[PDB]
Design a protein around this ligand. Structure first.
Ligand SMILES: [Mn+2]
Length: 192
DNA sequence: ACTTTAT
DNA sequence: ATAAAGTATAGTGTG
């Protein structure tokens, strides 16, 4: 099976939408409401605090510069962490939890533990997956541009699958220099 | 490497 | 007027 890891840039304006989905505050034909109690959150975060509020307070309190966070700032990079169904069918509940906790560890150790703003695991859709918001805050500065550039995303695609298999998980990296285009969830569904 | 942003 | 961070990136699946 392939390791699926990819980020989506979150500005202020789409964090409300991310929170609404991640915390199940609504539904979509592919969400089994009976299975939603099965989801879990891997961080210590407060469920009654928006992501937009949480991240802004954290950055505003920690930043070296006196300038306000720009309105088009990438407040976080939401990584999807997943694989195919076959990969998951092989794992019990405990192993599935370890898998996501392990993925979270990679990003904690590489980009700062205090930057993992949420790590929300969904078992009530088609396949287990985690929406994990990594705040690109380093050296007192917030910059997705500085944290996740071309070389860095290339590095993750090689190193993260390796780190997972080093920790017990049988999955391989995606095709090197893969020519695929990201489809949206809704666009992937039309494709099937 | 070219714009937008908050000074 | 200045400089940091915006824009993409790399990967596969019914997020
Ligand atoms: Mn989901």
């Amino acid at each position: 099976s392939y390791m699926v890891a990819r980020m989506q840039k979150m500005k202020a304006g789409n964090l409300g939408g991310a929170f609404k989905h991640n915390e199940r505050v609504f539904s979509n034909k592919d969400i089994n409401p009976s299975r939603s109690h099965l989801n879990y959150e891997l961080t210590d975060r407060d469920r009654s605090v928006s992501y937009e509020k949480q991240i802004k307070d954290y950055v505003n309190e920690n930043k070296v510069s006196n300038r306000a966070i720009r309105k088009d700032a990438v407040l976080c990079d939401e990584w999807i962490i997943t694989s195919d169904k076959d990969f998951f069918e092989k794992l019990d509940e405990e192993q599935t939890r370890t898998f996501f906790e392990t993925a979270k560890n990679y990003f904690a150790e590489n980009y700062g533990e205090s930057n993992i703003a949420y790590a929300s695991v969904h078992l009530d859709e088609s396949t287990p997956h985690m929406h994990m918001g990594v705040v690109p805050f380093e050296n007192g500065k917030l910059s997705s541009k500085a944290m996740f550039d071309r070389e860095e995303l290339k590095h993750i695609q090689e190193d993260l699958p390796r780190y997972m298999s080093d920790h017990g998980f049988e999955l391989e990296r995606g095709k090197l220099n893969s020519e695929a285009k990201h489809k949206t969830v809704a666009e992937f569904k039309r494709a099937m």
